[PDB]
Amino acid sequence: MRVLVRDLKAHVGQEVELLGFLHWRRDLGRIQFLLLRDRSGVVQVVTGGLKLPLPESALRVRGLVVENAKAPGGLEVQAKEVEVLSPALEPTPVEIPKEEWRANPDTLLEYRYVTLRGEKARAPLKVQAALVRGFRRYLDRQDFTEIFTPPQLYKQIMVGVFERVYEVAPVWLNEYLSLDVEMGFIADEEDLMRLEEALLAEMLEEALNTAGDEIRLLGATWPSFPQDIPRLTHAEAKRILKEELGYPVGQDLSEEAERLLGEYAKERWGSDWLFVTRYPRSVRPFYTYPEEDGTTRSFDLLFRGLEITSGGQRIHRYEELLESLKAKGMDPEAFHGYLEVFKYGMPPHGGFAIGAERLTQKLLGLPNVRYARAFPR
Amino acid sequence: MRVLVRDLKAHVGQEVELLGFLHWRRDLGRIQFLLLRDRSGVVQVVTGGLKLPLPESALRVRGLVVENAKAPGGLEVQAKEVEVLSPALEPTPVEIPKEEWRANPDTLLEYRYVTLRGEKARAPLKVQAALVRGFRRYLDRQDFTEIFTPQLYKQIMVGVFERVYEVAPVWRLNEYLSLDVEMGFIADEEDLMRLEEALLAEMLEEALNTAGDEIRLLGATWPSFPQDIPRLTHAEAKRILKEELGYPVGQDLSEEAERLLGEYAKERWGSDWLFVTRYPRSVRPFYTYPEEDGTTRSFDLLFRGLEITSGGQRIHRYEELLESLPEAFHGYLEVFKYGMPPHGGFAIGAERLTQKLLGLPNVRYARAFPRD
RNA sequence: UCCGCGGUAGCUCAGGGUAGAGCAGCCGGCUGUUAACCGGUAGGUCGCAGGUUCGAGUCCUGCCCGCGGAGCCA
RNA sequence: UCCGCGGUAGCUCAGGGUAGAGCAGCCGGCUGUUAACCGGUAGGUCGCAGGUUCGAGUCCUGCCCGCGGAG
Ligand SMILES: [Mg+2]
């Protein structure tokens, strides 16, 4: 029976079998040390004599668990046998154990197919899966049906079918993971924003539970709790940036602007979260539910200065869609295929999407969003 | 506080608020009958006089729950107020309530955006969702890590997490959902075949739990339990098709052959499931683990005569990859220079599994928005 | 296009006269290493193709990749 | 590729001389409908483009599309 590094303290004094990779080796001749990496951690293995493969070789190690303050984690294994399941032919391009430092951020990307093996490298990917797991959990408990489509339209079509649906699919920095929610029979864009506060809360919970070790391994600072998130109207934000930050802003907020509104919110409310509501019709799709004062039932979520979520209520009346197409100078009978479904009693609905990697990145304090993705372009 | 159709019996004699669509209406003058569909089913609503929107209109109904044998499901609502949240402008192309019949197969597909609203139409989709919920739940409990990629990638991720899975769309009917599993540090293909059995079991369990009503609605027949599934080597099955089924088979089993082997399994073992092991190298990808006798550590799962799973062990020795090819795949091989664990995997065709489980006429019924 | 900084060993980087050293590697040595270190030894499209020079990694010309600034963006 | 059935209201199918019927739609009637039905009414690229005929959904030449069938 195999034992994971994370379960060693329970087998202190016992004989154990280990399966992992040769993380790193230090040969002193008479005695030598093995760092053995598995999906749960790394553990020191003591031995001697016998030749060892190059690092990154698949290994089976059978030995005796022992306490030792000298070893990382306070525990080590005295080797009785070291079997090699798969030997490494050459030395790795980069010294994996000596990451993240020791290798420029760019070199790490050129050798993703092996640098990803590092503890800190894989960590974000583990935390992300946790976030997504909690994502589905909550929505499922809330009577959401997961759908599998071939984009904005299909979700909508499915609302007249299941009332509440969600999807986790790739979209086109470049190619990213998008967590899309869409629910029917709502009152207004408020219903959506409330759902997202609860959903995010759950998503973070799941990460904190099933991905604690990784979260601590990265030394990330956990955000304030996603509840009663501050709301600013696009106009209100436009004014603050101007009069208080001396940063002239256009009709649409730039990444640079959102960064500032973030820092602003962190100071006035001590909140790592910020809701920007009521965008102008001009900067939002034609299907966005319009308001009388020239704005729209929309919103963006700024987590730590970065936008991680965009959504709002859609138009559901057939005529009001044409109305919106004309006002935005667009050919109505070019959207004939899209308009069809709205001829048949479409409920008041709306949705939003979360950027998995954006969220992951700003959560773990990663330098670049590309770290939150397994294989960037 | 909204009440779903499935929760009405607990509210008899009380005042409830319903949210759904006008599934159908029967107007008899001073009295009319509404069939109100929501995500949990349809209930009969009684009223009279007032104009009712065309079918398929979004509605809000406040009324009193009442027992009545004449009513479908034994329950009906006497409405005190009928609010219209969104009127339908035109009649639907097809009479949704009168599906599946009453409309040719190819027609339902041409009006998906609305016919999908039928109870039997959406049923498979709800079930496929359950099957996938189970898929993830099990693998999660077994220390698997879910990954999100742009075949090779899954392998690379093995040296990172040892055990990974992914639920992603593929191409190669035209666009289908694939449930891919890949795990390292295995003994042989047996470890994989044993995992798939335990997996399918958990999956069908989840379908039963969370998609029970739909499974009953479609009137499907449940398969035998996926355990100790009969195994049959490619050579062995080849012979059976020939001598006992008089169906000449080439170097590769055609769909027609696979369907006959299914009927065979149901007779000999009374099993809706069947593994086909040991395929000739010639008829399997280069990355497949070769054997001494020309065969390979591969397998195919035949659910009710239809392949729903294909897999086997992969080659993990850098040299043996060129040996089974070379410099064309220079970017692929690179990872195999650095201690690749003995590994393997398989992928499940989500729609295929859902189709054959629910006895659907054709695979496209399991897909929300099929290609053409 | 102009200015500036970058392009040198598997990795990180030094430098008008052999192109050099740490880490990774190889050989030898070493019973407690935490980025072990000691000796020896291998390792190159110095960006590429042409010039000045006895001599070019260094200077000249053109061109290729990258970052920042100026400019351009009727 | 060949062969054989198909293509008519929206849907599903009737048939050498206004192109029709029930389903739903519209108007009118009905307090227990389960695919409610009674009357009235609206609804067309008869596949598309060329021929025979005084007249073609109907026949005959080519093509597009669907289903099915062949070692
Ligand atoms: Mg000029």
Curated annotation (Swiss-Prot), chain B:
Gene Ontology terms: biological process: aspartyl-tRNA aminoacylation
PROSITE patterns: AA_TRNA_LIGASE_II
Positions contributing to ATP binding: E307, G349, A350, E351, R352
A GO cellular component entry from the record: cytosol
Reactions catalysed: tRNA(Asx) + L-aspartate + ATP = L-aspartyl-tRNA(Asx) + AMP + diphosphate
GO MF annotation terms: aspartate-tRNA ligase activity; aspartate-tRNA(Asn) ligase activity; ATP binding; RNA binding
Protein name as it appears in the record: Aspartate--tRNA(Asp/Asn) ligase
